[PDB]
Write a protein that binds this ligand. Structure first.
Ligand code: AGS
Ligand code: AGS
Ligand code: AGS
Ligand code: MG
Ligand code: MG
Ligand code: MG
Lengths: 327, 327, 327, 327, 327
């Protein structure tokens, strides 16, 4: 039948599953045809979350088109109310319109799906405190923790969303499913998706020119800050510096005379330095602004040239801000 | 002659036309007539995007100035929706919520019936990457390669907006048309320019001399952004200043000594200078505040003098911004 | 009389009505009444024009104070709607919001209405492209050759303002009215101001004592920067600069050896000091805060001493602003 | 008694009523009882005045605490307007939105009330020439002569004020009312000082410590800043300064070098110096780059020593800010 | 004891209340439970005082536990307010804006809530005269002190802060209950986080992640501000200084080359240093920052290395700041 069925991501037993990164043409129908069926089978109530209030008028549609699947049950949709057997089965909620839903009747639900969670192509429009609210949302509208499902379908090709900014996820393009103790990021039908888009440019060559626009192909490309060098030695080393309560050693090597800055503490503890007296101690000395720079003339020249290398991007940023303060 | 004349625009028949000029001077007249002409031919309904929502509460009189074009049949508005003899005419919405629209069926489109797509000196209105927003709009008004023909229409001619140089849309003041695969750059006849500007000279003499200023001249002729003297020559590559991710270099031609800022490459592997740490890696060298004025002594002096010359407008803008950064 | 009516001013029929200062002369309510009379007797629509959107309370602040003076006619206030004798002809017009203007069809308004024209010590966030904005509005409404008038009044006598400077008008207290090829200027009388000053002094001693204060003088006579010395002379020419639009040319007189500043410029290949590259070209020269001071120490020491006299008021203004920039 | 009593305050009944002292002792409530007594029995309309937008929005609550005073009448705030007995009784107008509001309706005005006309522990957050905006208000309200009042209320005696310094008044700390033909300066009674202070002490003992805190005394008896040394002597002077439109003389003592800054400005061709660029005369000299340090060495050292002595509070402060601007 | 009991704090029932050094798990839990229950049983209004504007969105997320203690009370978040059972409970405002909202009088406030009056291990930028502004608020809202309290919670144990120095407090952190006439200082037992956090985590892991908010971890950790030894020496002093109204006298012990910073300083003819004009008087001597080193080279050197000593861990604050004034 259909290539993709959410049965795998449901049976994974993971509390949090994220079907994010595809069109949703088959996906949304796939996991919208099941919940009404679970209601009819085991009285299992269901909630869909639209991104915001005006989307309530866009959710009444599907009950009509699912007619072929649901012949023998009376189908009614009344704003938020979902009526099957002339009875309440599901509820659709906006994120900002939440107050009236706090006292609303949600006896037992194990599904909350976010669709179009990001306002697509607004000026990064933010819904106030999405996840700071969502924590109490999950613990409140749902009954318990045993068998609770918090899912997010996506249509936008999002390298990250503010929800991810909170949870701080680290997925990969390779792993179709990204499973953890709690969470699971799923990238749907990646090849077919791409193929499913290919064919539409055959239906319209001007859409071929539109695809040729680097904007369409650059949302498949992520951008961020990147590391510089990941280096270490196996030989002698001399200096030591500390800043903002964090210590950075200095490594040297005679072979090519190279110079690295890697984590190294010397209980011998000579010439330990800071830029600012917020890290004062009887051992360290408040460095003169630039004379100590000339003392570390080799370090200065290594910064000017390529002779300075490091083993982290975090060490990169700390060292770089120190360099900016150095002059 | 007399008015705005879309005959050549319709004639050369790009699937996507691109015209500019005539601020309020019928740049919207003929193009609001044309959808009703398609309706008298009994074609398809049109789509009207708006920049924002308040702009909608007053604009229900969209057919007032086309009655004197076509007094014959019924051209009215029931409210938000436009009706010609009672049949649906225009799908009329601002930008904010097109995503909620994009799952609806849109089988009938005729033409693009919006103007002031981009306003001069107006980016607070703008939405980030709205060029791809128009891409989503077009693909959600596409069913095949037919039924659609598009126009852009800015009040004046500029060469700095992302769309142009993204498509290398280059205006020509000697010739009316500039032709590409699908993109045209045009303006009404220079003879029609003479006729209509002379018509404005007639009557309100103050409204004529206000056109005598370049203030009202540039709105319709579009002579803008060509500010610095600019040339090019065959000198040798000497220096290159990697700034914010650019391979900018300097040609120095001693015969008739001037510095030309054209872009090129040689395997110099030296003399490449960076003014930021983000553009620095382990094969180029960093330069602090003053040392640019000394190592690029030729650059500094030729900038202070009139001896510095330029090649391209984008290079001119980024170089002046750099000249602001260098202190 | 009590409240002068501007028909004698309107007699000349130039579109621009530059009335300045006149705190409390009743130009406000005269320009309220006049379009009402025009609509009543002929049928011409009217629009109350301000600069910004946020003011909505001016539904009642404009129309109540002038509602009663009409003896035997009907008026209706419907928010942004104004009705005279059951005829809808009046609405509020914001300038900061230009976009709604470019959608709205123009009501046939004989004269645009505007007082509080000048900004006195505002936050300086006025409308950019201000004179261009007024030109765009004038072109937008009545694109035909039918003539349209405008009335604009300033709270206090600011001798130079962006539009006044822009169209190179010049003020003259001695002659109340002023006429050019396409311009009309006007100044308030002194008899009415004297009468009102006696009214305040005899009425209450608070404003009787406040009359001797500077601010009340400014409310009638409009104290400006004219007080500083302002003369020119026919001495020999010495030096020349260009500053963001004005080509200052400075003369020197050995007799008493002072220095004079005039807008007259000597066409000469001598070095011209440009403070900003926005005036850079082949022959001008860019200079920074040190060497301009070192080579124009003549000018600077002459300025701190009593050794400068300016030809024109705008010359004084631009010279002082430039000196502030240099400081 | 404990309540704030305005009987002797109205005993003179002048329009400029600077009411000082008794921080937060219900003087503002005693005000609030007044415009009710005026409007209800007479129909006159009142004006509420405060600097900034938060105090514009929540003025209803400041009227809500009035909903207990007059039971029979109806007191409702619609929008940001006060309705007493179902009729419009007053308006609350902020200052910063001032110019546009100059054209507000004043069919009749009773009292323009402004708490905290002195700034409270802030950083120069005075609307520049706030006095100009206030006096423009009184000018605009002055169309209906009879019974106009402009009440301004504060909480501490302070010659550190644009107001008192601007009107060149000499306040007193013991004369219960410093009166002129137009204005009043009120220091509250003595018995109620003790009454409220014992009230604070009895209610709580850290309130007694506040009674030991000099801040409470300043908010009760006022800071005249008389503490800084002050004297004068017949001895002559060397230099002469003008700052912020005020002359200034530097008396020099024959013996002991006790420098005086008394206002002894003899009209002389002697050298006179300023620092603010607004001060320029044909007779006097400007000073820059710390030349004044090399001219008045003895004054600089004398202030850096205990030698200097200031004749007047206005003189003393003005010298302070001049020193602040010097560096 | 597993649960902190705010009964312990209100058993001593002092008006001035400082709950400091809490871990903010059980202390925050109980403190959150306290006030709404107190109002519900009796009735009270509360103010949620905070630092700045960016934290205005944090207040809307506060009832994650209290509603759990109220299975039958519905607390609805209305923007920046809370409604208990549909009734406006109190209000939440950033502290600094209160100065603008200074003069507003509120009916009868019982508990004045504040959190983290001391902000530890950060920038900790504090507006000048914060304590004076807080006392201004206290004076503003109070006439009758019948059972009114000002409660503040901070998660730090430290005697160096604006408030303790302001009130001349000397609480010893080793103990757990120091008292003043109307103030109380306590340190809650650290073992209070357990039964609040790892019980609800030991239940289920997804519950432990439900705890979260990612901010409890900052408060739980504790740090000691002591850097070097604090001692007093029996060798006599040489120089003395006065800073921001806080005196100081530097002592020297030639043996072992030490210097001490005991505040106890002997007045004599030797006039002290000063750094700002306000602090200056008719007897003391003031110096510029550069000549400060040329007076106390030994102070300079003791700031370079670790020669200088201290007498109290709070003194190190004044020393650090005055060092920064040296620049
Ligand atoms: N075929 C035409 N017949 C008559 N007038 C025309 C014709 N074409 C253009 N015009 C002129 O165009 C004016 C109205 O054109 P508009 O629709 O305003 O064009 P526009 O440039 O879009 O200006 P805006 O900003 O859209 S209102 C009329 O008042 C005429 O002066
Ligand atoms: N038709 C009228 N009926 C009655 N009073 C009028 C009329 N026209 C003007 N006035 C008077 O004009 C006086 C001045 O009010 P405004 O009309 O606001 O003056 P204004 O000239 O706009 O002041 P400026 O120049 O804008 S600062 C008022 O006191 C009115 O009584
Ligand atoms: N008749 C009254 N008797 C006693 N206290 C009163 C009375 N009327 C008001 N108050 C109280 O006075 C206090 C301060 O209110 P305000 O009227 O604003 O004081 P104020 O004198 O105006 O000083 P500010 O700076 O305006 S708050 C409040 O606590 C009121 O409850
Ligand atoms: Mg148009
Ligand atoms: Mg006016
Ligand atoms: Mg008050």
């Amino acid at each position: 039948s259909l290539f993709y069925n959410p049965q795998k991501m449901l049976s994974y037993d993971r509390i949090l599953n994220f079907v994010i990164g595809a069109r949703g043409i088959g996906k949304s129908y796939a996991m919208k045809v099941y919940p009404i069926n679970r209601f009819i089978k085991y009285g299992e109530q269901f909630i869909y979350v639209r991104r915001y209030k005006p989307e309530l008028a866009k959710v009444s549609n599907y009950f009509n088109d699912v007619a072929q699947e649901f012949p023998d049950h009376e189908l009614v949709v009344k704003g938020r109310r979902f009526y099957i057997d002339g009875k309440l089965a599901g509820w659709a909620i906006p994120l900002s319109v939440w107050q009236s839903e706090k006292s609303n009747a949600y006896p037992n639900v194990s599904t909350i799906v976010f669709d179009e969670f990001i306002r697509e192509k607004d000026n990064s429009n933010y819904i106030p405190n999405e996840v700071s609210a969502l924590l109490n949302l999950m613990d409140t509208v749902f009954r318990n923790r045993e068998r609770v499902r918090c899912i997010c379908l996506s249509n936008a090709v999002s390298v990250v969303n503010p929800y991810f900014l909170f949870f701080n996820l680290v997925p990969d393009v390779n792993k179709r499913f990204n499973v953890y103790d709690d969470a699971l990021i799923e990238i749907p039908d990646s090849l077919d998706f791409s193929s499913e888009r290919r064919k539409t440019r055959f239906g319209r060559l001007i859409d071929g020119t539109e695809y040729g626009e680097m904007s369409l192909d650059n949302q498949f490309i992520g951008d961020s800050q990147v590391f510089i060098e990941k280096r270490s030695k196996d030989s002698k080393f001399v200096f030591s510096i500390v800043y903002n309560g964090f210590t950075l050693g200095v490594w040297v090597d005679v072979n090519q005379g190279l110079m690295y800055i890697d984590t190294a503490h010397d209980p011998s503890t000579k010439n330990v330095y800071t830029l600012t007296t917020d890290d004062l101690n009887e051992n360290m000395m408040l460095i003169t602004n630039y004379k100590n720079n000339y003392h570390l003339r080799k370090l200065a020249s290594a910064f000017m040239n390529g002779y300075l290398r490091f083993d982290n991007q975090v060490i990169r940023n700390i060292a770089y801000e120190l360099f900016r303060k150095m002059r």
